[PDB]
Design a protein around this motif. Structure first.
Motif, mmCIF file in Angstrom:
data_model
loop_
_atom_site.group_PDB
_atom_site.id
_atom_site.type_symbol
_atom_site.label_atom_id
_atom_site.label_comp_id
_atom_site.label_asym_id
_atom_site.label_seq_id
_atom_site.Cartn_x
_atom_site.Cartn_y
_atom_site.Cartn_z
ATOM 1 N N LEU B 2 13.155 -4.214 -1.757
ATOM 2 C CA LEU B 2 12.272 -4.988 -2.619
ATOM 3 C C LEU B 2 12.233 -4.479 -4.050
ATOM 4 C CD1 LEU B 2 9.219 -6.105 -0.540
ATOM 5 C CD2 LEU B 2 11.546 -6.976 -0.689
ATOM 6 N N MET B 3 12.939 -3.394 -4.356
ATOM 7 C CA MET B 3 13.005 -2.873 -5.714
ATOM 8 C C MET B 3 14.236 -3.375 -6.457
ATOM 9 S SD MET B 3 10.267 -1.527 -5.278
ATOM 10 C CE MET B 3 9.213 -0.777 -4.041
ATOM 11 N N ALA B 18 8.411 -14.706 -6.135
ATOM 12 C CA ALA B 18 7.990 -14.165 -7.423
ATOM 13 C C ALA B 18 7.197 -12.875 -7.256
ATOM 14 C CB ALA B 18 7.169 -15.208 -8.181
ATOM 15 N N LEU B 21 8.933 -8.657 -5.448
ATOM 16 C CA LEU B 21 9.586 -7.506 -6.056
ATOM 17 C C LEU B 21 8.561 -6.559 -6.662
ATOM 18 C CD1 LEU B 21 12.147 -9.429 -5.831
ATOM 19 C CD2 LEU B 21 12.959 -8.216 -7.858
ATOM 20 N N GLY B 22 8.786 -5.262 -6.463
ATOM 21 C CA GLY B 22 7.919 -4.240 -6.999
ATOM 22 C C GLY B 22 6.764 -3.835 -6.110
ATOM 23 N N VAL B 24 4.965 -1.982 -3.116
ATOM 24 C CA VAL B 24 5.301 -0.730 -2.451
ATOM 25 C C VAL B 24 4.814 -0.688 -1.001
ATOM 26 C CG1 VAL B 24 3.233 0.455 -3.287
ATOM 27 C CG2 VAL B 24 5.286 1.771 -2.710
ATOM 28 N N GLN B 27 7.195 -2.659 0.998
ATOM 29 C CA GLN B 27 8.386 -1.835 1.163
ATOM 30 C C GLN B 27 8.188 -0.774 2.235
ATOM 31 O OE1 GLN B 27 11.410 -2.389 -0.141
ATOM 32 N NE2 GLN B 27 12.017 -0.758 1.271
ATOM 33 N N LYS B 28 6.986 -0.203 2.335
ATOM 34 C CA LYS B 28 6.711 0.747 3.410
ATOM 35 C C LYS B 28 6.859 0.084 4.772
ATOM 36 C CE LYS B 28 5.054 4.394 3.403
ATOM 37 N NZ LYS B 28 3.715 4.833 2.919
ATOM 38 N N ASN B 31 10.510 -0.439 5.482
ATOM 39 C CA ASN B 31 11.152 0.824 5.818
ATOM 40 C C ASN B 31 10.837 1.235 7.247
ATOM 41 O OD1 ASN B 31 10.920 1.606 2.476
ATOM 42 N ND2 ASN B 31 12.792 2.076 3.613
#
Lengths: 41, 56, 39, 465, 133
Positions: B2-3, B18, B21-22, B24, B27-28, B31
Motif C-alpha cells: 500500500l506504499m 484514493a 495508499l499511505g 499503515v 498495511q499491518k 502483512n
C-alpha cells in the motif's frame, strides 16, 4: 453560436463517361456468315 | 503493498482506491495475512507434502 | 461499318453493375411508399 | 445446348468447334466475365495459329477489365501484329478500333501517348466521337476546363449523341461558376435531351435531380409555403431518381440522392441503410464521407471517426484539410458527449496539423475553441481525475487561445464577428484564467498531502520494526 | 442496430476432419490487425479462397419460443445470405489494444481479434452474425 467551424457537403457527383474499348463482333455474329455456316453440307 | 503505487491494487477495480495508499494499519493487516500465507506455504512444503504434489 | 462491328461490354444503365450487381428494389419500394406517397 | 455439345464431342474425341466457345463467351459477357474469358482462351488454344483479330481484341479487353495490364497489353500487341493479315476492306476500320484501344491503354498508363494517338485517329477519322470526347476530356483535365469553346463545338457537332451531351453536361457541372454560365442552362439542355432525344436516359435525369436538390437546398425557408416549395423540388428530384430506378434498380447514384434528400428531410435511418449498402457496393471517397456525416447525424461518433479515417487514408492520403476538419469535429463531439480528455487532445492535435497545413482563420478559431473547451472541461474536472501537467497545458492553451482570439478580431473578415471574439477572449481571461490557477493550487495541495502521508507512513513502519 | 460492420477477404479455407464445416480466416480490408476465424456450413454458404465477405454483428434482428418466420414480417436478416446466432463465452480484455471475442454458434466457433475501439460494443451475452456475398 460561436463554436467549431465545419462545412457539410454531400458528394454525389457523377463521374465522367469512361468510353471503354469496344468489343469486336465475331464473324459468326453476322447474319450472312451464320447462314453460310449453318447451311454447310 | 500500500506504499508503493505500482505494487498496489489496481485503481479501476476498487471504488476506494484514493484513500488506500499511505495507510499503515491496513498495511499491518495485509502483512499479517501475507505472513500467514508464508507460514502455510512452509508448513505444506516442508512437512506435509515434501515432494510438492498439490492435487489432493 | 465501325458502328456495326463495335460492341460495348456493359450497357449505359448497366455500367453501375459491372462485375458485381446489387439490387435496390426494396429501396425503390420504400422510396415510393415514403416519398411519392409521403404524407 | 452448347455445354451438351461440348460434352458429347469430348466423349466422342471429336474436334470441338471454337464457334460454340465464341457463342458461349458472348452469352457469358452479360453473366460471367470469368467463364467467357476461359471459353475464349479455350477457343484460342484450339485455333492455335488460326487466332483472329477479334479474339485477341476481346481477350485484351477481358484482361483490361480484369486489370491484367500486362496480359491485356500483350493481347493488344498480338492483335496489332495480326492486323497485317486483315482483309483490306475492313482493315481501316479494324486499325482505327485497335488504335483507339491502344490509346485507351495508354491513357491508363501515360496520357501523352494517348493524346498523340487521339490526334492520329482524329486526323484519320474526324467523324468518330469517342476519340474526340476523350481527347477534349484530357485537354480539360490538363487545362482545368479552359477549353469550353471546344466542348461547345463538340456539342454542336453531335447534338444527338448521348455521350457528347453527357460529357458536355459533366463539364458544365464542373465549371459553370468558373465560366459564369446560367445555372439553369444545363437544366434546359438536359430537359431538351430527355424530351426530344431519350426520356429514359439516367444520366440527364440524375443531373436534373442534383440541380433541383441544389436549388431546393439553397432556397431560403421562411414559412410553410417556402418549405413546401423546397419539398416539391425535392419531390421532382426524387421522381427523377425513381424513374432512373424503374429504368434500372441497380443504380447506386439514385439511392445516394435519395439518401441525401432523406438527410435534408432528417430521415437518418434510411440514409444510413442506403449508405451502408452503397459502401458494400462501391468504395469511393464520397461514400466514406457521407457515411461519416450520417454517423455524426446518428450520434455514432466513433464510427464516424473510423469512416473519416478510412476516407483520409484510402483516397485523400492525408492531404485534404476538410477531412481533418471532420475528424476534429467528430473527436470534439466524442469528448463533449462522453467527457473524455483524450478525445480533446486528439482533436487539438488534428486541428493543429490541419492549420499547419493551411494556416487559415477558420482553423485558428477552431484551435481557439478547442483550447477554451479543454480549459473549461479541465476546470470542471475534480482533482482526483486530473493532474498538474494537464492544468498547465490547459492554462498555456488558454493564453494562446486568447492571443489568437485577439488576432482574429484584428482580421478583416474573421469567421465570427470581431466583437464576439473580443468578448469571448475577455470572458475567458476574466474568470476561467483565475479558476484554472485555483484548480492548480488545489491540485498542488492534494499532491502535497499525498506525499506527506507517504513519507509519514514509512517512518512509523521503521519505528515498529 | 448493428454493433459491428466490416468487409473481409478470405485468406485460408480449412475443411480438415469434417465435411460440412469449414474454418475460414479473414482480415479486414479497411483495417488490418482485425482477424476473423469462423466456422461455416459448407453446404449452405460455400466459400472459396480470396472471396470478399460483408460481415455484420448485431444484438437483435429487429428493425421467447422460436417460431418459423412468417413471410409477411421483415427483419434485418432479409439483406444477408447467412445468419447465425450464438453466445459470447469470452471477452479477452487483453493488451493495450488487443481484444479477442469468442462466440460459439451452437458449437461452431468464431474468434474476432481487433482494437478496443472497434469491438467495445461487442460485450453482449448473445450475438447474431450476418454474412453477405
Amino acid at each position: 453560436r460561436q463554436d467549431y467551424i465545419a462545412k457539410v457537403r454531400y458528394q454525389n457527383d457523377l463521374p465522367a463517361p469512361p468510353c471503354p474499348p469496344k468489343l469486336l463482333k465475331y464473324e459468326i455474329e453476322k447474319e450472312a456468315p451464320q447462314k453460310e455456316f449453318l447451311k454447310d453440307s | 503493498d500500500l506504499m508503493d503505487e505500482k505494487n498496489s491494487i489496481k485503481p479501476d477495480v476498487i471504488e476506494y482506491a484514493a484513500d488506500i495508499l499511505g495507510d499503515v494499519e491496513l498495511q499491518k493487516e495485509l502483512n499479517s495475512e501475507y505472513e500467514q500465507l508464508v507460514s502455510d506455504r512452509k508448513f505444506l512444503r516442508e512437512i506435509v507434502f515434501v515432494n510438492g504434489d498439490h492435487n489432493w | 461499318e465501325i458502328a456495326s462491328n463495335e460492341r460495348v461490354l456493359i450497357d449505359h444503365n448497366k455500367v453501375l453493375r459491372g462485375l458485381k450487381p446489387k439490387d435496390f428494389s426494396s429501396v425503390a419500394k420504400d422510396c415510393e411508399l415514403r416519398i411519392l406517397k409521403e404524407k | 445446348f452448347l455445354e451438351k455439345y461440348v460434352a458429347v464431342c469430348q466423349e466422342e474425341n471429336y474436334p470441338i468447334l471454337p464457334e460454340a466457345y465464341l457463342v458461349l463467351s458472348r452469352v457469358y459477357e452479360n453473366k460471367d466475365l470469368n467463364v467467357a474469358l476461359d471459353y475464349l482462351m479455350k477457343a484460342n488454344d484450339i485455333l492455335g495459329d488460326k487466332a483472329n483479330v477479334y479474339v485477341l481484341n476481346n481477350l485484351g479487353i477481358y484482361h483490361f477489365f480484369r486489370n491484367n495490364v500486362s496480359q491485356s497489353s500483350d493481347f493488344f500487341a498480338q492483335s496489332l501484329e495480326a492486323l497485317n493479315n486483315v482483309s483490306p476492306q475492313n482493315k481501316e476500320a479494324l486499325s482505327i478500333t485497335l488504335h483507339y484501344n491502344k490509346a485507351r491503354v495508354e491513357e491508363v498508363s501515360n496520357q501523352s501517348e494517348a493524346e498523340k494517338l487521339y490526334s492520329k485517329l482524329m486526323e484519320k477519322c474526324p467523324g468518330y466521337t469517342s476519340n474526340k470526347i476523350r481527347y477534349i476530356y484530357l485537354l480539360a483535365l490538363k487545362s482545368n476546363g479552359n477549353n469550353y469553346a471546344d466542348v461547345q463545338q463538340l456539342l454542336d457537332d453531335f447534338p444527338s449523341d448521348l455521350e457528347v451531351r453527357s460529357f458536355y453536361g459533366w463539364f458544365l457541372k464542373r465549371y459553370g461558376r468558373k465560366n459564369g454560365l446560367k445555372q439553369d442552362l444545363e437544366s434546359q439542355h438536359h430537359k431538351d435531351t430527355l424530351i426530344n432525344y431519350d426520356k429514359h436516359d439516367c444520366y440527364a435525369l440524375l443531373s436534373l435531380g442534383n440541380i433541383y436538390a441544389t436549388i431546393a437546398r439553397e432556397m431560403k425557408v421562411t414559412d410553410q409555403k417556402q418549405n413546401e416549395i423546397k419539398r416539391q423540388q425535392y419531390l421532382r428530384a426524387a421522381q427523377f431518381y425513381h424513374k432512373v430506378l424503374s429504368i434500372d434498380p441497380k443504380n447506386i447514384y439514385a439511392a445516394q440522392g435519395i439518401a441525401i434528400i432523406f438527410s435534408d428531410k432528417e430521415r437518418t435511418g434510411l440514409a444510413l441503410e442506403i449508405f451502408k449498402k452503397v459502401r458494400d457496393t462501391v468504395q469511393d471517397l464520397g461514400t466514406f464521407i457521407n457515411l461519416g456525416h450520417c454517423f455524426m447525424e446518428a450520434k455514432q461518433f466513433g464510427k464516424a471517426i473510423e469512416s473519416y479515417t478510412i476516407a483520409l487514408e484510402k483516397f485523400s492520403n492525408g492531404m485534404d484539410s476538410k477531412l481533418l476538419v471532420l475528424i476534429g469535429r467528430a473527436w470534439y463531439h466524442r469528448g463533449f458527449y462522453e467527457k473524455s480528455m483524450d478525445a480533446y487532445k486528439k482533436a487539438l492535435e488534428v486541428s493543429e496539423q490541419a492549420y499547419q497545413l493551411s494556416k487559415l482563420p477558420a482553423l485558428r478559431f477552431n484551435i481557439v475553441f478547442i483550447q477554451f473547451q479543454i480549459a473549461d472541461f479541465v476546470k470542471s474536472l475534480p482533482n482526483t481525475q486530473r493532474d498538474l501537467t494537464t492544468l498547465e497545458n490547459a492554462l498555456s492553451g488558454l493564453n494562446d487561445a486568447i492571443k489568437s482570439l485577439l488576432k482574429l478580431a484584428e482580421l478583416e473578415q474573421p469567421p465570427y464577428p470581431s466583437e464576439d471574439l473580443k468578448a469571448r477572449a475577455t470572458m475567458g481571461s476574466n474568470t476561467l484564467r483565475n479558476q484554472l490557477e485555483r484548480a492548480i493550487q488545489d491540485q498542488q495541495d492534494y499532491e502535497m498531502s499525498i506525499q506527506e502521508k507517504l513519507r509519514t507512513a514509512r517512518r512509523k513502519q521503521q519505528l515498529d520494526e | 442496430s448493428a454493433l459491428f460492420d466490416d468487409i473481409f477477404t478470405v485468406q485460408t479455407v480449412d475443411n480438415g476432419r469434417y465435411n460440412k464445416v469449414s474454418r475460414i480466416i479473414g482480415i479486414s480490408t479497411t483495417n488490418s490487425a482485425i482477424k476473423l476465424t469462423l466456422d461455416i456450413n459448407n453446404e449452405m454458404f460455400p466459400v472459396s479462397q480470396d472471396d470478399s465477405l460483408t460481415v455484420t454483428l448485431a444484438n437483435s434482428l429487429s428493425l421467447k419460443s422460436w417460431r418459423p418466420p412468417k413471410p409477411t414480417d421483415k427483419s434485418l436478416a432479409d439483406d444477408y445470405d447467412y445468419v447465425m446466432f450464438g453466445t459470447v463465452y469470452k471477452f479477452e480484455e487483453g493488451d493495450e489494444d488487443k481484444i479477442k471475442v469468442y462466440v460459439s454458434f451452437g458449437g461452431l466457433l468464431m474468434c474476432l481479434e481487433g482494437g478496443y475501439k472497434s469491438l467495445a460494443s461487442l460485450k453482449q451475452d448473445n450475438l447474431y452474425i450476418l454474412i453477405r456475398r
